[PDB]
Short mmCIF file of C-alpha atoms and ligand atoms in Angstrom, two decimals:
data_model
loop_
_atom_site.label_atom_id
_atom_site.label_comp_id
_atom_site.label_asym_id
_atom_site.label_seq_id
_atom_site.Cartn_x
_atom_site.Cartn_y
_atom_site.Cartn_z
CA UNK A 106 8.06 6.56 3.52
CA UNK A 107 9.63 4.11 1.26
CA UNK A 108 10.97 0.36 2.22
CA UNK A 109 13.05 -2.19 0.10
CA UNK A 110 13.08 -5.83 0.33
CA UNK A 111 16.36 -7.24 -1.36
CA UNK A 112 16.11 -10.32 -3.69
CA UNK A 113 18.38 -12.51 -2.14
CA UNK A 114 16.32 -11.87 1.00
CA UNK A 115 13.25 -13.66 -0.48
CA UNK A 116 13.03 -17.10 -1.88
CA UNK A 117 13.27 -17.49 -6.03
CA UNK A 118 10.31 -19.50 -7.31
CA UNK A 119 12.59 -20.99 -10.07
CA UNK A 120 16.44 -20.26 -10.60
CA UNK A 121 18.45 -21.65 -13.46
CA UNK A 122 22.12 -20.50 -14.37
CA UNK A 123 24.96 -21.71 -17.39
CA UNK A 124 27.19 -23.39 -15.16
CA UNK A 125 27.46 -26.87 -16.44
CA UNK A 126 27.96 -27.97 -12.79
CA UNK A 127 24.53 -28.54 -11.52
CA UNK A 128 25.11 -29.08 -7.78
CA UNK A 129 26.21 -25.67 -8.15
CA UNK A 130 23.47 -22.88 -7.46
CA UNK A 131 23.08 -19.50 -7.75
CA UNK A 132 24.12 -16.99 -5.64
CA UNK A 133 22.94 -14.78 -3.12
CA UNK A 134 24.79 -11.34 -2.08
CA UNK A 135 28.31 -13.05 -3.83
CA UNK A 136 29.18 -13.93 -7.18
CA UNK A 137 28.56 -17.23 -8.80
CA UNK A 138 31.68 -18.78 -9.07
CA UNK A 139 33.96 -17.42 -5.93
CA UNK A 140 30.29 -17.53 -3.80
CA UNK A 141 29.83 -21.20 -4.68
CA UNK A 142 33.73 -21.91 -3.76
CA UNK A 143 32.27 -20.28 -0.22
CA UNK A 144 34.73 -17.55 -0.51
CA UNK A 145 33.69 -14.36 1.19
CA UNK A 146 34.45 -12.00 -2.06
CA UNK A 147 31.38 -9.78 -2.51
CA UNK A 148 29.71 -8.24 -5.46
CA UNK A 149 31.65 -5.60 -7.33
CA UNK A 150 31.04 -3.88 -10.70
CA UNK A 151 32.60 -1.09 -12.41
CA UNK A 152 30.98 2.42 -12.19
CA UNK A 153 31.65 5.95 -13.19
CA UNK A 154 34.95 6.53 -13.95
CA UNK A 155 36.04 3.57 -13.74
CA UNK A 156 36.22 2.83 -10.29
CA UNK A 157 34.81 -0.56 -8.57
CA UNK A 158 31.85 -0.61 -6.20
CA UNK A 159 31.25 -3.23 -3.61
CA UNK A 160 27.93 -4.68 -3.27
CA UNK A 161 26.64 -5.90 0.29
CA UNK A 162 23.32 -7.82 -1.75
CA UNK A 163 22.53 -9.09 -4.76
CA UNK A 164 22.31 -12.20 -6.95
CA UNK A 165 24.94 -13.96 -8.61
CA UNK A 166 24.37 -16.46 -11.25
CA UNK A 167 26.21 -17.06 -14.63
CA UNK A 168 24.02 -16.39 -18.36
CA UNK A 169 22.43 -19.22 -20.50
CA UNK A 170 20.27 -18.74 -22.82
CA UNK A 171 18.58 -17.54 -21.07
CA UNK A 172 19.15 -17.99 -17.44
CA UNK A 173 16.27 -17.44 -15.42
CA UNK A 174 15.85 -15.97 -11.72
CA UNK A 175 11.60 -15.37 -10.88
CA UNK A 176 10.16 -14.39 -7.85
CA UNK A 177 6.74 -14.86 -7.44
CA UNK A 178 5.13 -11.08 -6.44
CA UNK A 179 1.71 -11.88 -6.16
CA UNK A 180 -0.44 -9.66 -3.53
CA UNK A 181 3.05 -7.91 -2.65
CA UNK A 182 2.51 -4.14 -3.48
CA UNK A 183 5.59 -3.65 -5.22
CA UNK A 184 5.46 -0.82 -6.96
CA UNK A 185 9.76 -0.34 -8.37
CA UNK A 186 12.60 -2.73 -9.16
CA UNK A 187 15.92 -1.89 -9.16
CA UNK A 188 19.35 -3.39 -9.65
CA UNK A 189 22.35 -2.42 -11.22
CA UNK A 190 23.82 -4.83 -13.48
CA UNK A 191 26.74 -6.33 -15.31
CA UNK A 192 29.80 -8.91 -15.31
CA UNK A 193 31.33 -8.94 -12.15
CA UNK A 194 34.53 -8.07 -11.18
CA UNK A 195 35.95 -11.47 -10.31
CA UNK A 196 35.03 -12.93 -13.84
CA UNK A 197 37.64 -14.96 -15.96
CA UNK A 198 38.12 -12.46 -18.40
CA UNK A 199 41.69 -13.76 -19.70
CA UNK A 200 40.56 -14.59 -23.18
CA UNK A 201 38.20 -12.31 -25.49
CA UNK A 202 35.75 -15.06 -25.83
CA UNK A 203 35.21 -15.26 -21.89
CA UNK A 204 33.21 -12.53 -20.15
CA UNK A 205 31.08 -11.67 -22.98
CA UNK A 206 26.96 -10.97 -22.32
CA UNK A 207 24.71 -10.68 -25.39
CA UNK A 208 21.99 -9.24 -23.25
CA UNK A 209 20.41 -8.79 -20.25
CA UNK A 210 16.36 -8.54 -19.13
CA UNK A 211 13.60 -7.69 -16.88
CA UNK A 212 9.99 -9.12 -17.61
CA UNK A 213 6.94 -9.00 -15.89
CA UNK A 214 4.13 -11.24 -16.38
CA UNK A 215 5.57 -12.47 -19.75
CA UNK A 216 6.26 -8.18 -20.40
CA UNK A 217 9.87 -7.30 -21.18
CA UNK A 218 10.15 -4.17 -18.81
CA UNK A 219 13.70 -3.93 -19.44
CA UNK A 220 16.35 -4.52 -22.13
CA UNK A 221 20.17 -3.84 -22.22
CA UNK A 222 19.85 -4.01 -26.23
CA UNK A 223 18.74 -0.23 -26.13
CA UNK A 224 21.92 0.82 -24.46
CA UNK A 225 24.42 -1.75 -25.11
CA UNK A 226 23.80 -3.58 -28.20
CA UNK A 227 26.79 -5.31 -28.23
CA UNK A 228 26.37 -6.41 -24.84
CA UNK A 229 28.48 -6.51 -21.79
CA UNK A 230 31.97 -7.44 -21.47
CA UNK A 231 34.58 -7.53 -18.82
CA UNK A 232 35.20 -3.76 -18.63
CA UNK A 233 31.57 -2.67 -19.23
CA UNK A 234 30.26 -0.43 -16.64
CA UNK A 235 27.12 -0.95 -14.94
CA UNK A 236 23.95 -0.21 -15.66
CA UNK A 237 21.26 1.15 -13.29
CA UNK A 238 17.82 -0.62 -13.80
CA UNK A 239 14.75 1.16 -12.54
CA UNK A 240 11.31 -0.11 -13.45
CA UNK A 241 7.61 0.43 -12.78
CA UNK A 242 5.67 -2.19 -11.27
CA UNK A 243 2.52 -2.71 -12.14
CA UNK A 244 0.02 -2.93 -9.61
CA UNK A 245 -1.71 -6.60 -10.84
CA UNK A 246 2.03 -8.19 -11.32
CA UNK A 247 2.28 -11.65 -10.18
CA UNK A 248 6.04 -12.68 -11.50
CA UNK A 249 9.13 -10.67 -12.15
CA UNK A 250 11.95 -12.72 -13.89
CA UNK A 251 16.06 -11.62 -14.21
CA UNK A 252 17.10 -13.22 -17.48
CA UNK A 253 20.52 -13.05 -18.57
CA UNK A 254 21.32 -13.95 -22.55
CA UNK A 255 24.97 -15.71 -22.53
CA UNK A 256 25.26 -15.68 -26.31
CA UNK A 257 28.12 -17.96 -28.05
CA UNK A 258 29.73 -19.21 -24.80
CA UNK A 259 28.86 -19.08 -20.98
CA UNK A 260 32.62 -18.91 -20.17
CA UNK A 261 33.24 -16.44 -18.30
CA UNK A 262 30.02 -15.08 -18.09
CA UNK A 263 29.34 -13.45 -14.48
CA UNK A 264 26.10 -11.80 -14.29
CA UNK A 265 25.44 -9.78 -11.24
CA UNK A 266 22.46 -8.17 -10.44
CA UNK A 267 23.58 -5.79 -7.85
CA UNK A 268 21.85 -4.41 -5.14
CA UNK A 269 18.73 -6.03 -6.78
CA UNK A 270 15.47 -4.89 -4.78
CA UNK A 271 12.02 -4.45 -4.84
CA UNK A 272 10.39 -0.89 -3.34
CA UNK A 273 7.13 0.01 -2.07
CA UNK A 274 5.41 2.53 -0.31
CA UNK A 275 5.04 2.13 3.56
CA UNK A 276 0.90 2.41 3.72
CA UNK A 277 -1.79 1.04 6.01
CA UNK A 278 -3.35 -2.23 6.01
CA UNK A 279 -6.72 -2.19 4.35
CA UNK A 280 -9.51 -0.70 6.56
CA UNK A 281 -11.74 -3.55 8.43
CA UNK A 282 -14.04 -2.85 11.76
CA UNK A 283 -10.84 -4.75 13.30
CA UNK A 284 -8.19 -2.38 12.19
CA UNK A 285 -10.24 0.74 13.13
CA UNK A 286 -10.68 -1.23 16.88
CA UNK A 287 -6.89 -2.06 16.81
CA UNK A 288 -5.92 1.42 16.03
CA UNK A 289 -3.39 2.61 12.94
CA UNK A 290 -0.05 4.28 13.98
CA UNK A 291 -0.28 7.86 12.67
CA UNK A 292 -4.52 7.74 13.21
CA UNK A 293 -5.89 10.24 15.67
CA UNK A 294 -9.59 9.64 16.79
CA UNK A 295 -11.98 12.17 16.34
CA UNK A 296 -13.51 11.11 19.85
CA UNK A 297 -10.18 12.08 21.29
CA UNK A 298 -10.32 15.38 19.84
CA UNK A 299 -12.31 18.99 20.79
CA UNK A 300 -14.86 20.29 17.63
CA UNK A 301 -15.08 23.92 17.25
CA UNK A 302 -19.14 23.02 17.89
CA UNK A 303 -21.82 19.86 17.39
CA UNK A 304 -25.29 20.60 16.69
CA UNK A 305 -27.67 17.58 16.94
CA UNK A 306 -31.48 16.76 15.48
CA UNK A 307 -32.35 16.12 19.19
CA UNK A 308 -34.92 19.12 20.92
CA UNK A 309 -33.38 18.78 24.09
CA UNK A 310 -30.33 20.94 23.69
CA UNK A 311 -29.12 19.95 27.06
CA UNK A 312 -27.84 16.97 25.19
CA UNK A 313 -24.59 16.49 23.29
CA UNK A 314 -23.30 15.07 20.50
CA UNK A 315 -21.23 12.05 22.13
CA UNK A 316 -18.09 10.53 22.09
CA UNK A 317 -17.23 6.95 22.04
CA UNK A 318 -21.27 6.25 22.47
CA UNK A 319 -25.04 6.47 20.18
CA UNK A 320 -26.04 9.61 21.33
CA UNK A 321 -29.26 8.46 22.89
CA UNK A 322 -27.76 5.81 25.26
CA UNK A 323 -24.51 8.22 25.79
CA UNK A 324 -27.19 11.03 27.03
CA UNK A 325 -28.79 8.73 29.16
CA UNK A 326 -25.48 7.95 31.27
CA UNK A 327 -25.20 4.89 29.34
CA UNK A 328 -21.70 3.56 28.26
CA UNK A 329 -22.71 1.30 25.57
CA UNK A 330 -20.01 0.63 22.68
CA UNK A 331 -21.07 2.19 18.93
CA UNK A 332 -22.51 -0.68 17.47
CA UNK A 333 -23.62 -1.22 13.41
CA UNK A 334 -23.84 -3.81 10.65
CA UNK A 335 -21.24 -5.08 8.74
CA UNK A 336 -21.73 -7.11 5.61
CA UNK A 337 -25.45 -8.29 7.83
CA UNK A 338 -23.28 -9.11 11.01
CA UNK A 339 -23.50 -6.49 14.47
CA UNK A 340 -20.10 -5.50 15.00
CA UNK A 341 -18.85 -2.97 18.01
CA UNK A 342 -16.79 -0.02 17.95
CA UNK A 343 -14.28 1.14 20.74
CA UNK A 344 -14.02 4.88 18.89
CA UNK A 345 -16.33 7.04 17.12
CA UNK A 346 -19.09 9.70 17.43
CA UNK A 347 -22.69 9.46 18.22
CA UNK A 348 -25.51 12.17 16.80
CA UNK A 349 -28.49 12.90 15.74
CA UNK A 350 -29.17 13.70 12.20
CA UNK A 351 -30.94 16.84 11.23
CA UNK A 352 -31.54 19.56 7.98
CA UNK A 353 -28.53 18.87 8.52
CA UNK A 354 -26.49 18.48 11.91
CA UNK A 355 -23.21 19.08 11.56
CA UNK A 356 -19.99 18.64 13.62
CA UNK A 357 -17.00 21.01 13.06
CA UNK A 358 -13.38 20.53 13.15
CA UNK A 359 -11.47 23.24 13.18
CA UNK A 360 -7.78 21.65 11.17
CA UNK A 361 -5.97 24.28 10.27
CA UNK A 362 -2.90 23.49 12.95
CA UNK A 363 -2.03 20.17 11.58
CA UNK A 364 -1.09 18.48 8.05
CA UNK A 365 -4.54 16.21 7.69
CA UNK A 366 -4.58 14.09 4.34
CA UNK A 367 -7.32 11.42 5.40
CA UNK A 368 -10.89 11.08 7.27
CA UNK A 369 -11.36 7.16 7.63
CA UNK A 370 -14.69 6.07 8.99
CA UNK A 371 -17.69 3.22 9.13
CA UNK A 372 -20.70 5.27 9.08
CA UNK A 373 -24.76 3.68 9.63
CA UNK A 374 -27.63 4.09 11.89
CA UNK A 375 -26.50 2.52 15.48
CA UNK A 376 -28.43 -0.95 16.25
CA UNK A 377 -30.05 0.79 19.53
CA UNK A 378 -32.01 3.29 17.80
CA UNK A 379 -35.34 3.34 17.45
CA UNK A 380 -36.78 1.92 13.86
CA UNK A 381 -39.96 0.35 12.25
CA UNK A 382 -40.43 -0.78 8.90
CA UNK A 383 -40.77 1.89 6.34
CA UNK A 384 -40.65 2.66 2.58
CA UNK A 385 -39.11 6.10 4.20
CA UNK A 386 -35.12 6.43 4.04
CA UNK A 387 -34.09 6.45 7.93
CA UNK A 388 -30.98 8.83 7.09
CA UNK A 389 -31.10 10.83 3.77
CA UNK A 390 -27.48 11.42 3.30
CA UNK A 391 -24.17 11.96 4.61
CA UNK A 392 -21.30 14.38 3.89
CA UNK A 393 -17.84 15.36 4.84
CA UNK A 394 -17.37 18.79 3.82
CA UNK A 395 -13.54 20.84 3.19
CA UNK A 396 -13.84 24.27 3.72
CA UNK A 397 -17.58 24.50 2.21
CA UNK A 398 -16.62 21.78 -0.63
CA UNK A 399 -18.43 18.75 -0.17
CA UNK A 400 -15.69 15.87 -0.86
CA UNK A 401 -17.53 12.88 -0.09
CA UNK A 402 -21.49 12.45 -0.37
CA UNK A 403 -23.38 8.67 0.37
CA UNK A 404 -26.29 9.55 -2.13
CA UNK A 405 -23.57 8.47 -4.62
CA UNK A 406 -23.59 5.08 -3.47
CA UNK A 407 -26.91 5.11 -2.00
CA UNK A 408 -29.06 7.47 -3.92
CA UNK A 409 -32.28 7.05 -2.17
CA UNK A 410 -30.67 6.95 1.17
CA UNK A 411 -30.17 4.44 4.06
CA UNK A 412 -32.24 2.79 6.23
CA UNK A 413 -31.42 0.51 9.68
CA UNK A 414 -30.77 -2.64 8.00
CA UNK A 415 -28.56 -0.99 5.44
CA UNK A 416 -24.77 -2.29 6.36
CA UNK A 417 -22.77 0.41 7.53
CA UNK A 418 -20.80 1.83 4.81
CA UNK A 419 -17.20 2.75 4.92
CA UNK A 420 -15.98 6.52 4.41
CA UNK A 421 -11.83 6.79 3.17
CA UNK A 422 -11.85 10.16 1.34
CA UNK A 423 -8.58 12.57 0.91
CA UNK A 424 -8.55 15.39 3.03
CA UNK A 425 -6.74 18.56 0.64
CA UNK A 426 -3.51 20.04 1.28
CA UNK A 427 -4.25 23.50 3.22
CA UNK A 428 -7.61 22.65 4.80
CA UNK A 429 -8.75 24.49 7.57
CA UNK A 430 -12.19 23.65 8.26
CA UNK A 431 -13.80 19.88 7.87
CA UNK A 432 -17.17 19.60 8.66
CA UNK A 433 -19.37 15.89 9.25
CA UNK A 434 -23.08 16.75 7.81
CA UNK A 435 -25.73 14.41 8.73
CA UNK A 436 -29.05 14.30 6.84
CA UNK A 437 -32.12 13.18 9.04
CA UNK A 438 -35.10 10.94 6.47
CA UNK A 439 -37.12 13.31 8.40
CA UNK A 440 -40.27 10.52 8.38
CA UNK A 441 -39.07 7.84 11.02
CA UNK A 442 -37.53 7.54 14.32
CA UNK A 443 -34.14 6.05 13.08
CA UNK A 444 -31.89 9.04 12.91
CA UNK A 445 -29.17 7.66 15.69
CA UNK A 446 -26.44 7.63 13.13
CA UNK A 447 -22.62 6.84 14.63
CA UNK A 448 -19.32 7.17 13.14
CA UNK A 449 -17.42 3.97 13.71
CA UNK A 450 -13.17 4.02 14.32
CA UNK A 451 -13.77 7.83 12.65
CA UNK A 452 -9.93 8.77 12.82
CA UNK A 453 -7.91 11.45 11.29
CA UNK A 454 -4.82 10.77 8.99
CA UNK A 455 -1.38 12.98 8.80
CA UNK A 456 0.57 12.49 5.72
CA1 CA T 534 29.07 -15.40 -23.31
#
């Protein structure tokens, strides 16, 4: 799921243009010249064949040397650009001297991304089809700048950067406690959802693994909210899973009826468990296991395991195309009390 933002649907950071007529500015979705007259004309430019194309958006300005359009793209996500350009249409073009582009350009963060000079040499003239821009974005990029190179003369000189817009991919906000509370459209919680079977690290098999609750309050009729530590502060969960860790414990999922691409959960020992100071890890390790392939492990990150004041750590790993089977393994420290761990916001993605 892609989505565009148009150029002349933002705000330019600077914009200069060759029009010696400085109350004059440049243009969005018209020309320069007729859009600054206020006349309704819109963008056109020749294509294939030589037939014109009408633009709905775009910017309009006139070259320099250069002119400059930026837009500050700090923090945006943009990962494309893409415009076509050339002289537009409704250029003065009556004399050979008028309507006549040395060179057009796309930088990034001081980084010429694109040039007309590979192309078109010579430049573009009155009768010069388009040309269709498409450029990477990289990921860091703070300013993107059209530049437009007049040459000898401005006369004439009606740059258009049609259809100029900026694409990203539609993708979720960055995972906080809040967000997983919130809820993410496309997210299914794995509280809301039957497992094949849960085993626990609890002796009384009467119990179950527990939904939306720790496991020990949740077996005791108790409604309390899953509840861990986030960067030192308690926070509460409205979704998740509540078990017992064991050699291991493990809760099953059969997937194979649905498209999963993404397990997203906070995972620590729930404040209401049982604990006392120890050297002893409280919960050896955790995994999340694809059809018998373990595809995320927390020994990485915390090698000697976790213990109740550890901060809850957050789990985003790629589920594989095909998958039939995912399986949540919980490792007990096997020398202390603290083995309550919880699953907070533990959802299910479908890509
Ligand atoms: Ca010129």
């Amino acid at each position: 799921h892609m989505a565009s933002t148009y150029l002349s649907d933002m705000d330019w950071s600077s914009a200069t243009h060759g029009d010696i007529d400085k109350t004059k500015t440049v243009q969005k979705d018209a020309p320069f010249t007729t859009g600054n007259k206020g006349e309704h004309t819109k963008i056109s430019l020749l294509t294939s064949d030589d037939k014109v194309k009408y633009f709905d958006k775009g910017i309009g300005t006139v070259a320099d040397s250069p002119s400059v359009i930026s837009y500050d793209i700090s923090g945006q996500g943009f990962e494309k650009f893409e415009t076509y350009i050339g002289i537009d249409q409704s250029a003065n073009s009556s004399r050979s001297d008028h309507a006549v582009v040395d060179r057009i350009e796309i930088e990034i963060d001081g980084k010429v991304v694109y040039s007309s000079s590979v192309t078109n040499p010579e430049g573009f003239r009155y009768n010069t089809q388009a040309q269709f821009i498409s450029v990477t974005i990289p990921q860091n990029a703070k300013k993107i700048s059209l530049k437009s190179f007049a040459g000898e003369h401005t006369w004439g000189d009606e740059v258009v950067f049609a259809d100029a817009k900026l694409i990203k991919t539609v993708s979720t906000q960055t995972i906080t406690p809040d967000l997983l509370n919130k809820g993410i459209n496309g997210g299914v919680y794995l509280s809301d959802l039957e497992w094949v079977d849960a085993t626990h690290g609890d002796d009384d098999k009467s119990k179950t693994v527990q939904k939306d609750k720790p496991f020990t309050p949740g077996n005791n009729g108790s409604n309390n909210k899953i509840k861990l530590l986030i960067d030192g502060k308690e926070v509460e969960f409205n979704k998740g899973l509540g078990t017992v860790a064991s050699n291991p414990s493990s809760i099953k999922y059969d997937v194979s009826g649905a498209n999963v691409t993404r397990f997203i959960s906070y995972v620590g020992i729930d404040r209401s468990a049982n604990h006392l100071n120890s050297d002893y890890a409280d919960i050896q390790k955790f995994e999340v296991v694809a059809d018998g392939k373990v595809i995320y492990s927390s020994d990485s990150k915390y090698p000697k395991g976790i213990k109740y004041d550890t901060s809850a750590f957050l789990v985003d790993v790629e589920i594989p195309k095909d998958t039939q089977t995912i399986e949540l393994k919980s490792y007990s420290g096997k020398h202390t009390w603290a083995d309550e761990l919880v699953l907070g916001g533990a959802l299910f993605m479908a890509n």
